[PDB]
Design an enzyme around this catalytic site. Structure first.
Site, PDB file in Angstrom:
ATOM      1  N   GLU G 702       0.753  -1.261   0.000  1.00 31.24           N
ATOM      2  CA  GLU G 702       0.000   0.000   0.000  1.00 31.24           C
ATOM      3  C   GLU G 702       0.791   1.324   0.000  1.00 31.24           C
ATOM      4  O   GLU G 702       0.532   2.233   0.797  1.00 31.24           O
ATOM      5  CB  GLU G 702      -1.012  -0.019   1.153  1.00 31.24           C
ATOM      6  CG  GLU G 702      -2.077  -1.115   1.025  1.00 31.24           C
ATOM      7  CD  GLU G 702      -3.167  -0.794  -0.007  1.00 31.24           C
ATOM      8  OE1 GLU G 702      -2.971   0.142  -0.819  1.00 31.24           O
ATOM      9  OE2 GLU G 702      -4.221  -1.479  -0.009  1.00 31.24           O
ATOM     10  N   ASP G 703       1.729   1.424  -0.936  1.00 32.71           N
ATOM     11  CA  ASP G 703       2.579   2.597  -1.123  1.00 32.71           C
ATOM     12  C   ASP G 703       3.624   2.844  -0.053  1.00 32.71           C
ATOM     13  O   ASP G 703       4.183   3.933   0.034  1.00 32.71           O
ATOM     14  CB  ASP G 703       1.737   3.860  -1.340  1.00 32.71           C
ATOM     15  CG  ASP G 703       1.214   3.984  -2.782  1.00 32.71           C
ATOM     16  OD1 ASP G 703       2.021   3.929  -3.745  1.00 32.71           O
ATOM     17  OD2 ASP G 703      -0.014   4.144  -2.951  1.00 32.71           O
ATOM     18  N   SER G 704       3.882   1.828   0.762  1.00 35.96           N
ATOM     19  CA  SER G 704       4.924   1.920   1.778  1.00 35.96           C
ATOM     20  C   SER G 704       6.075   1.124   1.142  1.00 35.96           C
ATOM     21  O   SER G 704       5.851   0.077   0.538  1.00 35.96           O
ATOM     22  CB  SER G 704       4.462   1.304   3.110  1.00 35.96           C
ATOM     23  OG  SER G 704       4.087  -0.052   2.974  1.00 35.96           O
TER      24      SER G 704
END
Ligand SMILES: [Zn+2]
Ligand SMILES: [Zn+2]
Ligand SMILES: [Zn+2]
Ligand SMILES: [Zn+2]
Lengths: 56, 55, 62, 51, 55, 113, 1073, 46, 51
Positions: G702-704
């Site tokens: 999730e975009d981490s």
């Protein structure tokens, strides 16, 4: 997605209804832990190559 | 502005998901836990532990 | 802003190699990296991308 | 003293990376086990630098 | 409503002046006075002169 | 804008400066990790807490009344991979079939034929 | 001339104009010329003014002469980089201090060279263009509907009016009235259709006929003479008929000027010579001229109501930018004019020096300081925004900021066609104001303001038979000509008038900045000198080849590049095309042209210097912006202004609050040819990270992203952080001064919590000191109450530089700077140049890390999932390309529309050894067993956006409470508490979480008030001890209640009362139900 | 031995106290930094 | 510029400034016989994937 998503027939929707808040809530972590682990080893990626069309 | 909603024992920072946390958990930075408290009355069930936490 | 000792990526030293490189250019007119012993791109990019600001900083007075 | 355009801890970093000898590194002790308050010859190597 | 609000009181005779917690002052360690603590005085002054024209 | 934009969680003190939340409980708040921030409130009475755990616990929230269907599923990696792992072509040998059973905490302690 | 050639031309451009042309160019125009015309107009007083003197920077301080000032100082000492103003007054004189524009003309920097600057401590790379008021660097922001022009609008089905034409008019120089002309057209598209127009100061409206007779045209058909130019156009004429009947009742100039209500008739004239279409001229004997306009207008109206011409395009950029220079203008006047009528009072008291040259000095400062143009006084009715605080996060940040435009408030925000070339399509803020803030392309420039006459003359002597004497029928298809919105007569055969002016500009005898548009399709000639017209440059084509069919420029001019850009224009090889003139030209894209890999490609007057020039500073750094989903480019267009790097080199001698330098920069492995003018290669915004797009621990989800600790240690993405707390020693005309010491005890107590011990006796720290927690950074006192400064509670580091200094008022000025090295942490945000933003989720080391046989291991691991829906593919490409440029040592070009393909690069990568698509084999760092899959492993540039966790992490439990409310206080900086606003309320209520919600009370307000059992009020005089309760007035001491309500509410009530409403609080229901 | 304030250009060790003006032994330029500390600063190599 | 350094034992875990390794090659069964991988490809794995 169809069998384990936030969907109607959802194995989740069913496990909640059949077992309870608790049991199902745990269900996530498990299905997770097994899979995430597995993926950690099988690997997966994406690159320009996935976006190129056949020569013809 | 002040009645139907006010600023309120609260904290806020940046989220990043963790794949090894039970669905319902929520990892809190030590720093924060050492800041937010909880008024627990002394009772002969927790006196022992509390007198420790206090020391 | 000076040369980076050792490459981030793999670790191989690279502090000394600065002058050698910036030299094999000016004179020997040259590949440079390859002979300087900088194989895999991790360390490669290290040198080939450094922009030595320190020089300009040094142009300041006291 | 330091009039360089680089900051203190920037250089500090640098030296942390400078490779030192470590041949008989095994016949030295971890400052944590040595019974000397802080450091000494029996567990450390001191260096000078003047420029 | 004859008890709680009679038509006449829609006109003010004697003005209710609200206290400090309402229009707090903020000193710089120097003046510092609230907004209302002014249009109270602006009013007060516009009252004084009036009377001193009717006597 | 949801009954689920606020949910009661079990506290887990951990290091590093950030609220670490589970993935499957992502879509309810509708967050991502590109910098998104989260507010946390702490109950204070013995009942306040109870009221938080008996009605706002994340587990109670799994089936959303607005669309009479759950509202938290398996996202990204876990989903994507769960697919692969399922195909008839996906096989695993003992060495791993073991380290896999181990990761399931409730495991009965019995390796299936 | 091939494509690769046009680059040298562009190089040629910046060698001469530089990124901030606009700003400076427009400033000099105010100083040099403008400034004069302004002081010399309605000056002379019943005492006149002559030439004005504008000296260079000075510092008039008591205790010293007048020190010749310099930028870098005013900066540190918080002063004002302005110089003196003198005027040869008639019966030499001082009148105000004008804030100069850095890098301009009166700014010493304008000359000093490379070495010259290094000595003034001023970073060479600083392109300037900003002002330096009271310290901080202020940047004037461009303010975008042009004036003096005819517009026709259709007005909705529900309205007594059908169509209407307007023209906003104002004297380009002199007072400048803002009154518009309305030439309406009643009678909807049916009812049995008159034409009336609105005049300034006239209550009602007048039927055009009268406006004519009242003008100087009394007979019919002589009126239709002006409106219609073709006796054989019965339709139009018909329309007019009903109108004539309207005015048939007034048959002459006497009555004409009358019906407009001896006393009244005289006023009639006035509103026609000073109010009516006031531009053109407000003289006298020109009645005729205005008449032909009002005729050209009533014409334009009908030209549409008869479906021959569309409704005017409201957003045709060509017809819309008040840069810096202009702003000072309208501003100065407002000022000098208060000085003018000020000097009138000294002269009106002397029954027998005075000029307070502070209104022009202090006036100027106020505006430029805040951002409120219009004066001060009880006049906030101004605009805030003009003049801001110049960005200094990164170099590309500052550039961008200067090249910015505003627009006072669903159609305007759009990217219009007219926007091509002049404004960048991508760079523009998300949310809120989006599209109301535009940035300039690289090639764009703004007009400045030329003179009309040298062209009015140059005309009425080359075929321009003046309007004064016109005859519509003898001259039928007479092409009418306009000058800056005025009608200066027509012309017979124009074809030549045209290709003569155009030959005049190309030799350079009518400023390359002027606009000339010929609209054959309507028979008109547009002339524009105006100041604020955005224009771009183009190659001229002209079929001038007596050897074929061609760009006037040749490969001989190129290689020839004492040959600037000024010559490329003085030879008619390039032209400055504003948006208006653009309309009537045909532009060829690729100069040249106009494989199963490249993108499929589909009268000329000009060619495009280069398409990749329609971009502005922002996108110019984005690799292959022609390969990503446009909305993404628009994002990176913003994050760039938030990455780390080097914003100047002098930074080590700068005392600015907050500033970040990336330990070790790195010019990208892939670049834009444009970067070359954005000095980007010498001032990078990031580093080349060894990316690896794959799934792993599931912490890059999730975009981490996962960042390799090991290399984070070898110093990857580490950055210095500076800060500067500053203070003064205030005094009073009444000799009572403050102090800088190391105070303790001494009768007052007024002190802090932290320590003062790291304070030498001078009330300062030393630059070696390691300060932290709250440690008093400075020590000041007030005769002993403390005024000492504490290091912000969340911070800490080391002192880096202290400095004492004078103030204009001889006061003790002292600024302190603290340094800190900031290490990347499991939460800090990063991103590439593709809106591919993400934060750290965890950090593994080399072992734990996945790897490739070579050894090479990733520095970053982003998730394959951030690719499919983001669509940003160029990202994928920059990697490949850069994986080659890595191995080849050659710089990899990613620049926009070029001739480089994915099929090509892939072949180059196969020559070096690795898979033709990037993918590589990898062995799982934990077990060593290969990965069943392959990965897109390749070096990609990554900017370390600011926004690190430890600057946000905040937690509170009963802290500083507010005063009025008694609720917590706002903001994490002041130890505040997060709000539980409405929406949060709602939810809890949805949960039926009754108690917890009630617990608005425990975690915030709450308060014990004492009500009266009778008049339900908070009157009760509760002296809480001797129990005495009371509430005289209601005289009670017996029936009293105590309640628990949110103080905000207690307040709600006190408030209502002082407004005379009475909120009675009763503890028992009496009404039942 | 000993130093108090320095000048932004002609880095010449000065030294003053209240009212003794805030200039330099020549250059009018009234800036001046407050030279380093005596107490050594200790750093970590990471 | 005057310094004074103190060196100590330690390892790569504690800090990268320690580990003496710095890149290490590792491969096995170059000819995918064990099938510990599934080659990506457009038409021919063998020709498109470097030997
Ligand atoms: Zn390397
Ligand atoms: Zn020792
Ligand atoms: Zn009462
Ligand atoms: Zn000096």
């Amino acid at each position: 997605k169809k069998t384990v998503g936030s969907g109607g027939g959802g194995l989740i929707h069913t496990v909640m209804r059949e077992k309870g808040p608790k049991i199902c809530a745990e269900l996530f972590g498990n299905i997770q832990k097994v899979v995430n682990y597995w993926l950690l080893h099988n690997g997966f990626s994406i690159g320009i190559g996935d976006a190129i069309a056949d020569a013809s | 502005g002040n009645l139907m909603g006010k600023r309120v024992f609260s904290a806020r920072t940046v989220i990043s998901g963790d794949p090894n946390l039970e669905l319902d958990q929520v990892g809190v930075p030590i720093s924060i836990a050492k800041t937010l408290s909880y008024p627990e009355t002394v009772t002969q069930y927790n006196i022992h532990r509390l007198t420790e936490y206090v020391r | 802003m000076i040369i980076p000792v050792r490459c981030f990526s793999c670790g191989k030293v690279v502090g000394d190699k600065w002058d050698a490189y910036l030299r094999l250019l000016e004179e020997g007119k040259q590949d440079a990296l390859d002979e300087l012993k900088l194989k895999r791109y991790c360390c490669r990019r290290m040198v080939l991308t450094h922009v030595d600001l320190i020089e300009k900083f040094l142009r300041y007075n006291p | 003293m330091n009039t360089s355009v680089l900051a203190d801890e920037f250089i500090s970093h640098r030296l942390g990376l400078i490779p030192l000898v470590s041949e008989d590194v095994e016949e030295m002790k971890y400052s944590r086990d040595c019974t000397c308050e802080d450091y000494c010859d029996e567990c450390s190597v001191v260096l000078e630098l003047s420029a | 409503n004859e008890d709680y609000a009679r038509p006449e009181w829609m006109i003010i005779t004697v003005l209710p002046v609200p206290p400090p917690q309402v229009r707090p002052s903020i000193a710089m360690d120097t003046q510092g006075q609230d907004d209302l603590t002014h249009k109270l005085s602006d009013i007060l002054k516009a009252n004084i002169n009036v009377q001193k024209l009717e006597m | 804008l949801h009954k689920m934009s606020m949910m009661a969680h079990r506290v887990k003190v951990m290091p590093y400066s950030t609220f670490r939340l589970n993935l499957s409980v992502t879509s309810p708040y509708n967050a991502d990790f590109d910098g998104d921030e989260m507010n946390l409130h702490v109950p204070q009475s013995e009942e306040t807490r109870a009221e938080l755990s008996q009605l706002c616990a994340v587990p109670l929230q799994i089936v959303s009344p607005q669309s009479n269907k759950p509202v938290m599923g398996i996202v990204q990696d876990t989903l994507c991979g769960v697919r692969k792992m399922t195909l008839r072509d996906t096989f695993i040998e003992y060495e791993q079939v073991m380290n896999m059973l181990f990761w399931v905490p409730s495991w009965d302690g019995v390796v299936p034929q | 001339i091939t494509t690769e050639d046009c680059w040298t031309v562009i190089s040629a451009f910046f060698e001469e104009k530089g990124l901030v042309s606009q700003q400076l160019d427009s400033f000099d125009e105010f100083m040099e010329t403008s400034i004069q015309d302004l002081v010399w107009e309605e000056p002379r007083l019943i005492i006149r003014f002559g030439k004005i003197y504008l000296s260079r920077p000075t510092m008039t301080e008591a205790d010293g002469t007048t020190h010749a000032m310099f930028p870098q100082e005013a900066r540190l000492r918080n002063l004002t980089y302005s110089s003196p103003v003198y005027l040869d007054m008639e019966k030499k004189v001082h009148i105000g201090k004008v804030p100069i524009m850095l890098r301009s003309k009166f700014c010493s920097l304008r000359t000093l060279d490379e070495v010259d600057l290094y000595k003034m401590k001023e970073c060479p790379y600083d392109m300037g263009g900003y002002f330096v008021i009271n310290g901080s660097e202020k940047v004037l922001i461009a303010q975008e509907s042009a004036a003096n022009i005819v517009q026709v609008f259709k007005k909705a089905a529900p309205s007594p009016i059908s169509h209407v034409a307007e023209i906003r008019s104002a004297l380009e120089k002199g007072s400048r009235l803002i009154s518009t002309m309305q030439i309406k057209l009643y009678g909807r598209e049916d009812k049995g259709r008159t034409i009336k127009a609105t005049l300034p100061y006239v209550k009602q409206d007048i039927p055009i006929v009268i406006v004519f007779r009242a003008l100087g045209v009394v007979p019919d058909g002589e009126i239709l003479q002006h409106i219609c130019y073709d006796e054989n156009d019965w339709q139009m004429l018909e329309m007019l008929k009903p109108c004539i009947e309207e005015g048939f009742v007034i048959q002459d100039k006497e009555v004409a000027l009358d019906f407009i209500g001896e006393k009244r008739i005289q006023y009639a004239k006035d509103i026609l010579q000073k109010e009516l279409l006031p531009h053109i001229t407000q003289e006298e004997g020109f009645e005729t001229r205005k008449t032909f306009f009002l005729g050209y207008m009533v014409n334009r109206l009908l030209l549409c109501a008869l479906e021959r011409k569309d409704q005017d395009d409201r957003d045709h950029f060509g017809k819309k930018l008040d840069l810096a220079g202009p702003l000072l203008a309208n501003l100065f006047r407002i000022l000098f004019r208060k000085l003018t009528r000020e000097i009138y009072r000294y002269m009106q008291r002397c029954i027998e020096l005075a000029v307070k040259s502070t209104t022009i000095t202090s006036g100027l400062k106020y505006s430029l300081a805040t951002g409120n143009w219009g004066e001060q006084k009880k006049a906030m009715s101004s605009r805030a925004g003009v003049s801001q605080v110049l960005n200094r996060y990164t170099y590309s940040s500052t550039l961008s900021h200067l090249r910015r435009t505003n627009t006072p408030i669903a159609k305007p925000r759009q990217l219009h066609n007219t926007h091509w070339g002049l404004v960048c399509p991508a760079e523009t803020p998300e949310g809120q104001a989006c599209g109301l803030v535009k940035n300039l392309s690289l090639l764009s420039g703004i007009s400045i303001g030329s003179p009309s006459e040298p062209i009015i003359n140059f005309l009425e002597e080359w075929g321009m038979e003046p309007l004064e004497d016109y005859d519509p029928a003898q001259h039928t298809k007479s092409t009418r000509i306009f000058v800056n919105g005025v009608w200066t007569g027509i012309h017979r055969d124009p074809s030549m008038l045209v290709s003569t002016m155009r030959d005049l500009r190309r030799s350079g005898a009518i400023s390359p900045e002027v606009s000339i548009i010929r609209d054959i399709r309507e028979r008109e000639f547009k002339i524009f000198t105006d100041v604020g017209r955005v224009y771009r440059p183009l190659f001229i084509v002209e079929d001038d080849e007596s050897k074929d069919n061609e760009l006037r420029i040749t490969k001989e001019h190129i290689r020839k590049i004492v040959y600037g850009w000024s010559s490329l224009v003085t030879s008619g090889v390039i032209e400055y095309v504003d948006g208006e003139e653009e309309e009537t030209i045909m532009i060829a894209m690729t100069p040249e042209d106009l494989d199963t890999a490249k993108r499929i490609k589909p009268t000329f007057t000009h060619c495009e210097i280069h398409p990749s020039m329609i971009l502005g500073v922002a996108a110019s750094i984005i690799p292959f912006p022609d390969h990503n989903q446009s909305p993404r480019n628009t994002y990176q267009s913003a994050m760039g202004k938030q990455a780390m790097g080097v914003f100047l080199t002098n930074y080590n001698v700068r005392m600015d609050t907050m500033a970040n330098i990336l330990y070790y920069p790195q010019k990208p492995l892939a670049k834009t040819q444009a970067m070359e003018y954005l000095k980007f290669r010498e001032l990078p915004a990031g580093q080349n990270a060894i990316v690896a797009i794959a799934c792993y621990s599931g912490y890059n989800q999730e975009d981490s992203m996962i960042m390799n600790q090991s290399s984070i240690d070898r110093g990857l993405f580490r950055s210095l952080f500076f800060r500067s707390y500053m203070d003064q020693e205030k005094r009073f005309g009444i000799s009572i001064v403050e102090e800088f010491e190391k105070p303790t005890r001494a009768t007052t107590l007024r002190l802090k919590h932290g320590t003062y011990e790291k304070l030498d006796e001078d009330g300062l720290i030393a630059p070696g000191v390691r300060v932290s927690g709250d440690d008093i950074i400075i020590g000041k006192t007030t005769p002993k109450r403390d005024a000492s400064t504490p290091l912000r509670s969340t911070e800490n580091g080391i002192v880096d530089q202290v400095l004492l200094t004078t103030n204009q008022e001889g006061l003790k000025f002292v600024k302190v700077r603290m340094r800190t090295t900031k290490v990347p942490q499991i939460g800090d945000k990063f991103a590439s140049r593709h809106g591919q933003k993400g934060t750290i989720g965890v950090t593994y080391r080399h072992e734990d890390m996945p790897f490739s046989a070579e050894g090479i291991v990733p520095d970053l691991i982003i998730n394959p999932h951030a690719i499919p829906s983001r669509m940003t593919v160029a990202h994928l490409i920059e990697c490949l390309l850069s994986k080659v440029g890595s191995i080849r040592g050659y710089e990899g070009d990613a620049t926009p529309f070029t001739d480089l393909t994915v099929d090509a690069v892939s072949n180059l990568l196969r020559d070096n050894g690795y898979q033709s698509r990037g993918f590589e084999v990898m062995y799982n760092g934990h077990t060593g067993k290969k990965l069943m899959a392959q990965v897109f492993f390749g070096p990609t540039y990554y900017q370390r956006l600011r926004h690190m966790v430890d600057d946000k992490i905040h937690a509170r439990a009963r802290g500083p409470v507010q005063v009025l409310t008694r609720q917590p206080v706002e903001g994490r900086s002041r130890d505040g508490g997060l709000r539980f606003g409405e929406m949060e309320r709602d939810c809890m209520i949805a949960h039926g979480a009754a108690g917890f919600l009630k617990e608005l009370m425990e975690a915030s307000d709450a308060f014990r008030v004492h009500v009266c059992g009778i008049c339900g009020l908070m009157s009760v005089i509760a002296n809480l001890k001797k129990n005495q309760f009371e509430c005289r007035s209601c005289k009670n001491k017996t029936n009293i209640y105590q309640l628990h309500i949110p103080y905000a509410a207690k307040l709600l009530f006190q408030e209502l009362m002082a407004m005379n409403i009475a909120p009675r609080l009763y503890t028992e229901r009496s009404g039942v139900s | 031995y000993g130093v108090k304030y320095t000048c932004g250009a002609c880095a010449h060790n000065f030294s003053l106290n209240k009212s003794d003006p805030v200039r330099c032994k020549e250059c009018g330029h009234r800036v001046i930094y407050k030279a380093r500390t005596k107490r050594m600063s200790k750093f970590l190599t990471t | 510029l005057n310094i004074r350094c103190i060196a100590k034992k330690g390892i790569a875990k504690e800090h990268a400034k320690w580990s003496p390794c710095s890149a290490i090659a590792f491969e096995y069964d170059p000819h995918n016989k064990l099938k510990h991988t599934d080659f990506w490809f457009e038409v021919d794995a063998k020709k498109e994937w470097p030997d």
